[PDB]
Amino acid sequence: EPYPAWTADSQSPVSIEQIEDIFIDLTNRLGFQRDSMRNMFDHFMVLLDSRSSRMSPDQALLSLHADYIGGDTANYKKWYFAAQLDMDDEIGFRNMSLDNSLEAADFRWKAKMNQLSPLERVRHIALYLLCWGEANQVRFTAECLCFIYKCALDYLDSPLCQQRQEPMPEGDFLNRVITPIYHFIRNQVYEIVDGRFVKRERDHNKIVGYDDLNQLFWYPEGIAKIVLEDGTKLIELPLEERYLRLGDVVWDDVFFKTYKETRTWLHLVTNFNRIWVMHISIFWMYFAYNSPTFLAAYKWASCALGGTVASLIQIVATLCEWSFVPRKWAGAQHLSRRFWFLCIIFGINLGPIIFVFAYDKDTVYSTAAHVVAAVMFFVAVATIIFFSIMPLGGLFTSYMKKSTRRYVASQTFTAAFAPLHGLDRWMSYLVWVTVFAAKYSESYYFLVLSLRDPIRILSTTAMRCTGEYWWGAVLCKVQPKIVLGLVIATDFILFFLDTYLWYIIVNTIFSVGKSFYLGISILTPWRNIFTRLPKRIYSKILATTDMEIKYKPKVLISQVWNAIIISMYREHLLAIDHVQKLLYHQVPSEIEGKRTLRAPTFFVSTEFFPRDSEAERRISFFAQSLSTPIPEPLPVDNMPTFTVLTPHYAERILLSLREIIREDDQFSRVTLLEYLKQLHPVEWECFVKDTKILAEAPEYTLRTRIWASLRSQTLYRTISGFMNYSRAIKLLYRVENPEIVQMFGGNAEGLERELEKMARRKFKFLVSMQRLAKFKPHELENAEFLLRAYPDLQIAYLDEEPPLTEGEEPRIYSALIDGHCEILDNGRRRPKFRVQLSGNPILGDGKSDNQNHALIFYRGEYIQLIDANQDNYLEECLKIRSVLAEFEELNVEQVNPYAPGLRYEEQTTNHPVAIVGAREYIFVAAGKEQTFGTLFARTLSQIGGKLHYGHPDFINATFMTTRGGVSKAQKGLHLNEDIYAGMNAMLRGGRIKHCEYYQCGKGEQMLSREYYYLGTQLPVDRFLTFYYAHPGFHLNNLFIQLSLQMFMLTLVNLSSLAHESIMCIYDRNKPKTDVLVPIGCYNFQPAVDWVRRYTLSIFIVFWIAFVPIVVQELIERGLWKATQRFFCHLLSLSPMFEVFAGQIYSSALLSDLAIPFSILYSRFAGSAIYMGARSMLMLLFGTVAHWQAPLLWFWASLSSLIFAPFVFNPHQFAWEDFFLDYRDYIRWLSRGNNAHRTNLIMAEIIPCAIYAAGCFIAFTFINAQTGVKTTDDDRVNSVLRIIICTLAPIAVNLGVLFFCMGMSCCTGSVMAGIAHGVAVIVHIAFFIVMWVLESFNFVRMLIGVVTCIQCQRLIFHCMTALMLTRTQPSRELTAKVIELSEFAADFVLGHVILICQLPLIIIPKIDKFHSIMLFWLKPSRQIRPPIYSLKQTRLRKRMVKKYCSLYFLVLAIFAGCIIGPAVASAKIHKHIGDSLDGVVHNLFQPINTTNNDTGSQMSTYQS
């Protein structure tokens, strides 16, 4: 019989017959499609049934009306206010606070709904539901539905439709008002070609999407732009006849783009404008204070001028924003007003600084200098504090007039946030106060106060040296100032890493203190969880407090504890003797004869779980989760009905049979069974035994099919894993009320029948099987099999039909089939419903439009949406009605929302809860467990809010389906198609909370739109928390990588300068004996010691930030290993060992993030191998010139970067596989064959030449000899040595290239060989000429090479890009020049890589250890082929020895190139050149000089 909570009562305001009457009439007079009417009717009635099982039926209808259309939660009310009667500013004013006007209209609206007869509310809701059901693929645009809904509602109330004695034909609401909008959307992509559609490839910024499609309807002036077909405006017409001619509007002259994103670096300045301000500005002031080398008023004046940078940053953000919104669109004048205000602020700030900067040089004004300095210091501080807070999108809004728009974005649709009151408010305040009060305090004593001494030295010391021939000694005269500038620049970056460093520390402290203070789970009282289980189950999983008839509080627990255990055994996890001691046995009372209840000995105080199998894990976790304070549940008779969605494109329903054996030694290992059998060798044992009892044929094949199916990874395991929701309800139904079984005790069939009837109305399952009309006949059998297995299952699939007349698109439907539908002659079952779409719905990339077409059949109140790989064990399935109570809607009181008084200040249900994420963070001896518990949290809490912000598991269906959809996927917008739903619900009113006693069981977006709305309007509480989770992580891995490069640039110069000095011996105790004992010397010892204080502070940030991803990637073991690992270091190298114990994880992780040599090289290059190569060279130059002690710390790390991927490879290292890998490498090498425009050319030039010049400066200084006491006419003219060696090899390229053209004019593979043959030797030769030029001095030769390489790539970097910007004969040469020159570079770098393994192949037994190492990491079903024919063996040995000799030859010539000039360094003694007149002393002047003119000498000049 039908819905037994609305009909089976006697106080229902209406009758089920009246509802059908209303639906029939409403369909009749608007032409809705006939079957969707039945669908929506069933949906509505099920909704009423569910809502009326925990309240009076008089209130269910009221609550539904309030929630859909009319309450403070309904979307229709929001749109009606914001558009139909303006009043958008008032909502923003009221939000920031926490006749006409807002109170009056609100009162009128509230009092106009308080007097509706209960037969009108049903009509309203029915109309809305019908409109929502019909509109295909327009559900993504909420406000459109509101517009059509209002138009239809106004039309039906007219005296024009009530007198017309004729109903419009069916399909008149889909072929007249809905289809044109769809034709507009599909016409922005998929341009029609001669017969079909193809993906129209337009630029990503001329394509209107959904977000730009509905956003027209937010503003009153956005509606007034709807031109009709003739030319008149739609609004011009009266209200009643505004619906009929809605099919004549042309939706192609009426939609614009309204966002138009731009270059990526340009957003990060307007979005996150509060992080640059609080960092740059304060950073300025610190150095401005303690830098007296440029009285007492100048100091304060400068530190005050520090405050003028904040306003400048605000102005360049406002000005940058002006290129996002359109020109005349709503909210544009506010930008000009704000620009005016900010200009005034900037003027006020930097007005008087000029007056105090120089107007006081010993005149009578000094009485008025200090006062203005101090007051403007205070003003600057006030400005900084004001701009660090008060979001950019809302300031200077009180001082504005009425105007038209006082805000730039709608404040009722993108600025409605949850106020987050309670206790967590103070906690967030405290956290973000301590972080920034610790960082600003410690980053002044370790980073600006310890840098105070070198500033005085390196800013006054003046060099004395001859110089060069083109400018003399004007550039080399001030080297130290450049070093100081580079030191400050490379230290400015670390100020940004410091914050994220402290944010990790203070979070985990606050978590431990909060999880220990509240006295929850003190350390580990482990021998108590099992001791007191029964009191946990009886009051957390059973609802007895409101069940009464209290009797026997232990017979109930017995009925449960056996069910959970037996289920484990039925899955072949426990032995038959292994369960009898793990179950409530009942023993008869020997006194009288009746039965009594015992308890397992395990359960009060012998291998309960075999070799800690997973069966232990399931029980263990279940036992701990009952300590958390779970809310008390409701009776299983009064819970809401929910549903489950699953999308499925193309998976495996079953592993078939032929794909179980296949061929053995043709792929990984052997037949699949034996692979599966070995992994679980305690189940197959129990399995075959279970077969024997059953056998005590196709069924056996089926049983093997299922047995394998439950393992591996398929679709059958998810369905059978989630269908435990069905049993968990039934079992808890009988237990709760045992008087229901006494009624018909003896009817075993009657009992089970009733139990099923309940579970089929509180739980629905639905999968969305796309493309089901075109399955292969071998795969269609699998689909039908599921229907036979679980009859209560629902499948939704698309369909087709030949076109009505020849030449048109075929109509497509979307029908569902149940498990009880009768079969037809064809074989497929007859569907229950069949709805008509308006064209192909699949338009996006991912599986997000798959969900939408099957969302119509979602009967229920809440939704749990899953992918096709989940487990959901039964023990984590019993407590479903406790997690479902997180939505605070189960224990409340109704208050008649339409009531006089009760203004919107003191209501309760204002921000409903939308998403509920689930638990995902799965988990000296006494000290070790405590410490390992602490290290657990630091790993734990790092991802507690990084991969857990919007990950959805349960969705409040009513709230989340009226405003948008469940997920969106478009070519234009790009977030992740998974996090988009999370952010959208936050900035629209909803709220997100997550439980912690459940098992989920599972940049290109900084360019997006939601980042613009979130980062410009959020308060500072939530902004900082938001910034340091998603954006501040990716933007942190870029600063560390950028800090390293800025460190190499300053290392080169610092060591170069250190290779020229006397250093004035220095003591690190208290060197205040200002005597400077070399007398005539200039000291640089403190500057050199700065390298020591940096390396320490750069691996700490590398340490803490890369420890928490260890355990979240290597939780598997370690505690057992830690004992022996500690056992090997009670007397080991300790602090230094920690250094070399902290350099391996980088090798470990990147290996897991990742075979012939060439194919691995080509994909691992361009990001890790090249930048590492250059940085390797610069470090080498430094380590030879001065050799600071703690410099090898980089040698380990930099080596590990480019030496790890070639040690974590599989068996490829023995003897000849190495050499045969050398076969194809050469063969592959032989056949490798590889203002709107003033922004792209500026972004890829500036930070590619600065790095070049910095190297170039160093080379000039190292040649200009200092302390040499020579004359003016000496010079070196070292600039030329760059030119003679930088462009000369490029000239050799073209000359041969032209001669290549000529020779053929006056074999292609051969011609490549000779071309590439000399393209390599030319560079190798020019490496030699540079060495000779510097008179055979290795130290001052390296820096020469480094400069040339940087200079070379600068030419290529700019020349190619400009040519692309801007001819064919010119361009065709360009690519050929760059290609072959780049070739020689890749050859040498590639070749040297496989040369540094010679002292690893000499060891006889090598891969044996290599095998042991890698198999520890992971097993991958290894296979070893013994395929070596007699003729293969001889040739294999034959050909391998061919290149094994060749390999050694190229090794010898490379070393020979080195030793050549090295041994010729004692043969030339006179000189190498004596030319003059511009090339004078060109090669290198000295052969014998001195650099120690100090001591006795008092005053010489040595210019």
Ligand SMILES: CCCCCCCCCC(=O)O[C@H](COC(=O)CCCCCCC)COP(=O)(O)OCCN
């Ligand atoms: C003395 C012998 C060497 C002569 C080297 C001639 C380079 C000639 C110019 C060139 O090829 O310079 C670079 C490549 O530099 C390098 O290999 C630098 C490392 C060299 C290690 C030598 C070890 C002995 C091009 O880099 P890309 O533009 O490819 O970088 C963007 C991503 N595609």
Ligand SMILES: CCCCCCCCCCCCCC
């Ligand atoms: C005030 C600080 C300015 C820092 C500018 C750094 C620019 C980037 C230098 C390195 C670019 C990449 C070189 C390969």
Ligand SMILES: CCCCCCCCCCCC
């Ligand atoms: C009662 C007022 C409390 C204000 C808390 C502000 C916290 C700001 C943190 C960041 C400062 C730069």
Ligand SMILES: CCCCCCCCCCCC
């Ligand atoms: C007269 C002395 C001028 C010194 C200028 C130093 C500029 C350093 C810039 C560093 C940029 C990374």
Ligand SMILES: CCCCCCCCCCCC
């Ligand atoms: C006072 C003499 C100044 C000579 C020019 C200095 C240019 C420095 C440029 C630094 C770029 C990193």
Ligand SMILES: CCCCCCCCCC
């Ligand atoms: C003021 C800082 C501007 C942001 C710099 C971002 C550099 C990386 C862009 C990819």
Ligand SMILES: CCCCCCCCCC
């Ligand atoms: C804007 C700078 C104001 C300076 C005031 C000076 C007054 C001088 C009075 C003698």
Ligand SMILES: CCCCCCCCCC
């Ligand atoms: C919060 C970090 C503080 C570090 C110490 C600063 C004061 C040192 C005084 C000796």
Ligand SMILES: CCCCCCCCCC
């Ligand atoms: C967290 C703020 C700590 C402030 C310490 C001030 C310096 C220590 C005393 C010299």
Ligand SMILES: CCCCCCCCCC
């Ligand atoms: C001249 C000092 C050389 C020190 C060793 C350089 C190479 C280190 C490789 C680990």
Ligand SMILES: CCCCCCCCCC
């Ligand atoms: C001039 C001092 C050189 C010290 C070299 C130390 C070598 C350590 C190799 C690991």
Ligand SMILES: CCCCCCCCC
């Ligand atoms: C010794 C004080 C220097 C200036 C500190 C400014 C702090 C601003 C928050």
Ligand SMILES: CCCCCCCCC
């Ligand atoms: C560093 C100043 C950048 C200014 C960009 C202006 C862009 C206007 C469209």
Ligand SMILES: CCCCCCCCC
């Ligand atoms: C001698 C009186 C000086 C007053 C200066 C006032 C400055 C206000 C910004």
Ligand SMILES: CCCCCCCCC
């Ligand atoms: C010579 C020191 C004068 C300090 C004046 C301070 C005024 C603060 C309002």
Ligand SMILES: CCCCCCCCC
């Ligand atoms: C931001 C206030 C604390 C840091 C500056 C004052 C103390 C310096 C030692």
